[PDB]
Amino acid sequence: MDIILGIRVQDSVILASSKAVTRGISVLKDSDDKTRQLSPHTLMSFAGEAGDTVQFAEYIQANIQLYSIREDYELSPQAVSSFVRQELAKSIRSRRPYQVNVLIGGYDKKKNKPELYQIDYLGTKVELPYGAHGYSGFYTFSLLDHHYRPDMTTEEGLDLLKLCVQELEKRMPMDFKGVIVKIVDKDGIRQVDDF
Amino acid sequence: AGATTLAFRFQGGIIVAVDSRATAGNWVASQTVKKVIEINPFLLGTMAGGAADCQFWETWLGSQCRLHELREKERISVAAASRILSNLVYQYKGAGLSMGTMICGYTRKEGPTIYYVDSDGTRLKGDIFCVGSGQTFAYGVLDSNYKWDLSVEDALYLGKRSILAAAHRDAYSGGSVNLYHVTEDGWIYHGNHDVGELFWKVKEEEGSFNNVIG
Amino acid sequence: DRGVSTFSPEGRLFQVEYSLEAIKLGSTAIGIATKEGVVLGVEKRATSPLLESDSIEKIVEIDRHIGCAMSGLTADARSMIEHARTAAVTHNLYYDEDINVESLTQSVCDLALRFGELMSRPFGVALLIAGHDADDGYQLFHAEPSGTFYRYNAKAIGSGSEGAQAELLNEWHSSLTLKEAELLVLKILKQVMEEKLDENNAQLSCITKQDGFKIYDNEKTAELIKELKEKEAAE
Amino acid sequence: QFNPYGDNGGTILGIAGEDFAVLAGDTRNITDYSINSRYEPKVFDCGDNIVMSANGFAADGDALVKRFKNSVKWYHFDHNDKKLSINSAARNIQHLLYGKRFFPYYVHTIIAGLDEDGKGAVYSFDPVGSYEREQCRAGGAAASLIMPFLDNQVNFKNQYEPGTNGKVKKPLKYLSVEEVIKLVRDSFTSATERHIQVGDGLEILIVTKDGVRKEFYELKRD
Amino acid sequence: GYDRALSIFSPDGHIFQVEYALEAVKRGTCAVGVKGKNCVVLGCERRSTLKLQDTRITPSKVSKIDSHVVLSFSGLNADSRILIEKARVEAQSHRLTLEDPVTVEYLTRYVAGVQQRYTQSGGVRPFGVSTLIAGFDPRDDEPKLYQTEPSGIYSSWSAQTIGRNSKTVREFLEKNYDRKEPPATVEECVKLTVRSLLEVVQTGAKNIEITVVKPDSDIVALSSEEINQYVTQIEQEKQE
Amino acid sequence: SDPSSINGGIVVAMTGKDCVAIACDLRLGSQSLGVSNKFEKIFHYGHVFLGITGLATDVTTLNEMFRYKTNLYKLKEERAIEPETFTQLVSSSLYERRFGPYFVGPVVAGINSKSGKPFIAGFDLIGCIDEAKDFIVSGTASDQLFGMCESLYEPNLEPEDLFETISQALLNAADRDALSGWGAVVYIIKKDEVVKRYLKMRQD
Amino acid sequence: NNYDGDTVTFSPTGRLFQVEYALEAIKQGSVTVGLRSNTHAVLVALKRNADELSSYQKKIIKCDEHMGLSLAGLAPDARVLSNYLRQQCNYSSLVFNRKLAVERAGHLLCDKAQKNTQSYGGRPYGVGLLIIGYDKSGAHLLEFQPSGNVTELYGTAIGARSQGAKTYLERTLDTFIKIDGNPDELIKAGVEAISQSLRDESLTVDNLSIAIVGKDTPFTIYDGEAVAKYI
Amino acid sequence: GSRRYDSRTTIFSPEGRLYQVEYALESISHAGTAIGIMASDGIVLAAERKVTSTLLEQDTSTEKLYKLNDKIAVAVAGLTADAEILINTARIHAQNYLKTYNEDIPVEILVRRLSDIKQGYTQHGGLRPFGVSFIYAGYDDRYGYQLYTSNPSGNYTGWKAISVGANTSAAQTLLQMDYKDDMKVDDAIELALKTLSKTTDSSALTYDRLEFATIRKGANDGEVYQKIFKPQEIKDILVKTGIT
Amino acid sequence: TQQPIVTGTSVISMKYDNGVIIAADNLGSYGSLLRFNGVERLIPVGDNTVVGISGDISDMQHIERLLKDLVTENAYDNPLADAEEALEPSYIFEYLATVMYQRRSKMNPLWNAIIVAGVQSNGDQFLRYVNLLGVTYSSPTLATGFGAHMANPLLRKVVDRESDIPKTTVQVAEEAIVNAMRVLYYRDARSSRNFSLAIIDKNTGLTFKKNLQVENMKWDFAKDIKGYGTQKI
Ligand SMILES: [Mg+2]
Ligand SMILES: [Mg+2]
Ligand SMILES: [Mg+2]
Q1: Angle ∠(A87,B91,D64) on CA atoms, nearest 5
Q2: CATH 3.60.20.10 applies to domain E1-240
Q3: Distance (Å, rounded) from C-alpha I220 to C-alpha I232?
Q4: Which residue numbers of I are catalytic?
Q5: How many helical (H) and strand (E) elements, i.e. helices and strands, does chain I have?
Q6: What CATH number does domain I1-233 carry, 3.90.1150.10, 3.60.20.10, 1.10.540.10, 3.20.20.70?
Q7: Which cysteines are joined by disulfide bonds (chain F)?
Q8: Cβ–Cβ below 8 Å for B59 and C93
Q9: What is the total count of domains within chain F?
Q10: Chain C residues inside the 8 Å CB shell of G73
Q11: Cβ D91 vs Cβ D84: under 8 Å
């Protein structure tokens, strides 16, 4: 429902997140950005229980930004993903767990490699070439399994992503009002305004 | 609970319009309820869901906003005010608070701003919001007639006409309409309008509601 | 050494008496109460010319109807002001009304003696609390670290307090206007201040029923200083 | 399993005039189909010309009134015997009720008195603390019977000026204390006929600048 | 818990523990803050009795509290780390609760409040640290420079110095700094800051640190060669 | 909503002649949905090997925990931890969470560096030790693994023979389980060399 | 000397110097007088000012409708003890629907002051109190000292030069005790009593403070023009 | 009460010094000298054991040099018991970081946290400070090889070469004289031993009175190795440099 | 959260011209088993108050202990403990009512229904009820359990309102109570024949009657009743 997708290509990570916010029988908003910049080369998209999603994302954002200031240094995507996983792993056995699923797209400047991490609300982390949360993967993974090549360009990745959104728009019961697409690479994070 | 509340951004600031009905089941407890909470002279809040929860915590919010400007010698942003409230209810999440409100304000750095704040922790910035049992009826009138370049006179009528639409169809909405116009220099009250008298008046002048004999 | 909450043979708390000596070292603050309003004025006393005097905040708002001036270890006043502001706003939340000036002062004075072995020492700052309410009208209070507060028609605190208080004794009467009170604070401040009084090293404020608590601009005070000098030369 | 709540029945009624205000309530206390008392007062003089009633679960109602009376007492101590205005009392009662938001006082509260301009004021509360000032308010078991009658006779709702084609409403106006008590007595005798939990007696507390006066009237005991 | 009231009043009305904390600041290496027309510059002394140092990894004297605010200090080095950490946490906490970064005045007020709390809390001694806090408020181009001290008092300064021989460099700044016309450019502001440190330092080699802060989170630290150019320029103009 | 069968997976361990073997599948899923084919369930702390099945977040968490504890053990003891000792550490750590347990089925495998004796052990989710001469099984196809191992296993197998036996036990068990498979790994552990082999299996 | 550093230390002669120093604070305080008949009890208090520009320090505090006290010494300590009395009076009313006895009020104050004289860290209260009240056993007057000692009396006085008023009441004992059903005459006797403790200064309109409680009279305080009658 | 017997460990002198910190440093100045030298391709840690007895078991002993993790080690100067309390805390902190981020802790972060603990004992709690000075030798992928020192004040600084304990004044002068930036590990080993040999209070420097350790990248391809020297290995390196 | 185990049934009471009467049977039931027969459920406090308790007996014994401790505590530092500052019925009631409401608010109630009967110091009759919910009410007649359904109707025929109290003598009031206890023995399955009765008069003080029995019962007509409809034999 909340659709969040992720594709790691040769030189970048692409995250696509649905714009709809629905409450009851009404679409309250159709331009919602379901992501937060954790650091200049690390982006986290999120989906799950209302309120928990944003509260969790911003809490993580604050912690990573605090680290950046303290050490005058950017944490690697792997390090950020491990921190995020631990927070969710703590959360699941709390009195009231964060019901939030996240994708973490980042570009490691030391390795010069893009990295995509999928973490569910239980604290289940996996590094993947492409990832999704919820029912989104049920439609798109067959397309990605087929067309996905590891040496693709950013433009080829966007075309592959378009193919996924088209399939979702065709077969998914709800209207998720399109997606906001963001690219993470060596030069940082930028948004594709026309999708 | 039963209500129709709306708020929308436009060229001349923000319009806030609400109904006045309170119901305990089928029993109509009140027709004179206040669903706009005057947080302070510059900030408004809407009541939908728990009446007490909205009253208590949006009054509490005004106290926090007053303390902010005493310490910082500056008007509080709508962003920060909405955040104080949403962070507060998020602490209480799961306990059973019931709240669906629009925190409305007009500042220099932001301009006219509306934040939908809700008891399960949601905090959304937006241009148009409608909340309550009659929200769908009000959305229809709003969406079809809304434009950014609306005049203050026409915008006030649109908000009034949208509540009337819901009051008519939604059984748990009605009584009277309370209008507000929010400007950078503060909000302005635009009166109480009985739906009984307002309906017949709009029917005649507009030509709408032909299904109703009058 | 010795206990913090110890009595002297004369029957006074050592630490409270010693904190009063710290207040005598502090910069001068004067308050005058009239039927048209209450005026508060302070000596800023910049330690160096490079210090931007406008950042010296020795007059402070508590609520719209209550103001405050301080003298002594001014850093100690921050938590007192924070408490006062919270007390004022909290009462408005509970009772949908303005809080009485006396009740506000009493709340602040309850902190005073909450020290021992609670905080480690008394406050080293005195406060002049000025305000207005519907019942008792325009009021001026002097809140000490002893937990005691007196209401005053006029009051000076700080280094030049005993000299200024003697001057306020002669000058004050029950029919003083607001304008007359403003000039009187400036006059007495100029007398006790070390450096020459101007708009940058001295600050005025007032509280009226109509407009509430207001700190005067440096432009407004400068005109009142000029008006004061002309009137003294006129006879 | 232990149920901490009960229903003691009863119904109450608050009406605000120009320079006065009334707070009425029946004197019958019940549990299920039994009568506990034919005369158990539930409208109280709380001081500072404020009258109060908290109808529903009597144990919670007595606790609330008792706490508010205590709140009035401490308001005097802490604020130099200042008179607690009706609006200040209302806000205070909100905080008393909302303080138990997650284990509520199961009562419908109404207070009456005069505002700071000397005009009649009635405030009504829900169990968790939402409040509103009103001219007219019925609470309790027979509120559904009494309230639409008041709408018609106090606020003149649905009554149009004769001959005006239903275009000119019947004009709002303040009623005398005598006319208000008539409506109160007829409201309760009507509710007594049709509601089993209403009867035995009617006690009215009238509030003017002079003070708080009481009036008692018998009701049917069946 | 250890409850002892360490900071207390004396007969003459002084709190010796707070005043002795100032003596620790007087022992500390000199730090100077000068604000120009469109920038603020923080200069810092580094004593030259320590050779065989590793300047890559050694803690820098100037610390970023946020991307738009910096903090330098004089006094106990270990004490400063505690104030810096608390300030950094509050900076992120403010962004989280108010959607806006801290003002320089707010950040100063917080740090000064922490320092004050340690002057009347049981079981603790005051911070033996005075700080210079500088930066630019969000969406603002007016330079800000504040000072704090162990007692907890804080204030704004056009230019200020703290630490050992600070009274000498304050004397220099008092006659050289014009209120009506502050340093118009970055170069002018840095030069005046270096000049003021050269009254006290000794040699202008690896003893002086300079950090320039500009609007919109534009902060940079100068290298040895860059600073040495200012030292070389000033000495040649001096011989006259 | 059964934590031990949400992610799926299996681990099996076996003893041979002066050697041990431990193997696992590579699947990680979210119920019906396969998510990862690279999720290795076997970890090692020095020369001691630990396989873990069950809830994947707890698998990851426990690995990080035993890495933590075995690193501190080594710093203080000035020597690497042995399998028998590690087995007790795992048991203690799991029973510490007796009334809020990690939903896991761990398996220890290794050779004692002093005595040279092959060692394997299994645990339940609250730390009960199941020591065995022959084999240990764990996961969503444990029934299937019990059936394969009990028929295929024989004592004192050489490393090269043991490899074939454990690989066949795992593969054929995994193919009769929906939630296991998607790749497999086998560790062959001798006294001072360890070989790791990825198996070719059906990917459905 | 060496035994006055804190309240936990006894002197070689068995004295508690910190308690005695607290007692000294009362002697410096302004004079206040208490006296009663069979029907009424009266407090009279000489208020003190900082200077002519200042207000006069309020000496009398109400505790309940039927009980209240006057203070001499540290005023904040009186506020703490009076607040405690207000709570205890109130606890008695809410729980037992019972007006607190004046004798129990004294016992509660004694025990509260005592705990502060036996423990390290704390200090004794630096104030003396005269509690009056009317309960089920008639009118009462109590004298509280911060040592813990509470005493029930017909009349008394505490503060500076209190010996003069105390001597007068000792002479007048037989007269004022029988002033029954006459509030104004009982006050007059109290005003004449406190006048024996005056030096150079006299009783003015904003200087004098009177309070009364009795049979059909709630505890009420008189200040300002309301005490002009008795000058 | 108990006020009478309180030494007030966390207060300032009139001159603005922390009494207990200064006196703790005085204690450390009598402790066996410990030297750290940082080279381009490694780090050396050398330390002198405190007046050794002939019946002391030398091979199975640890007094001066301790391992914090695989990439970081410390040389101790002061009370050994105090140091071990801090060392175990540092070992735990390193593991917490690894558990949280799946990366080995950066050297400075470990040093800062350990120094912050020392700072706490000087500002609050009313307890005596730790009578310990550390030399931290470690490696990470950010700054490479690093040498730090911390003392009871909780203040830490970075170094190319540094000494703690006894005769630091004399030792620092000798290091300042012969040290240069393009130095190798094998050269740094020689400098460390020569410096101790001249600054020692003993008659002659021998293998049994020393502890030695290196942190090289001498392992196979892009990885760090910690070598805590054995008695026989110290005996050999002492002969090889021509001291005995 | 509790469940009552050993229980006591109805407590009945009424006001008369000079005082109050209260009564309760001497039974402690264990469900349908009439287990304990020597249970006193009327507990005097001083010489001017009687507390009648129904419901859980273990909780009743707890309240007995509280009241006994209340008398002790009131006597401390109180020279007028047997005079002006003695315990009043209104003091004892308010204390219990405070306890009962506090316990229900902690979801751990005292599973009882209590009636406090007595005479105040000024001669006024005191009669008030409180239960496990903290609910309180007063009336000329009060009864708990079955007594509320069967006794009140009989007692209200004597004292139907406030004005009937001066017209009602102690002889008439006692007769009505004793009659009511007989009716409860006829119709309440958890009642006993043996009961206690207490009178608190403003002149003659406290009279406590133990070991009373229900008598003058009508059972003879039972012999004429045969079958359930058609049966003649
Ligand atoms: Mg009936
Ligand atoms: Mg399979
Ligand atoms: Mg398949």
Answers
A1: 155
A2: yes
A3: 18
A4: 1
A5: 4, 13
A6: 3.60.20.10
A7: none
A8: yes
A9: 1
A10: 11
A11: no
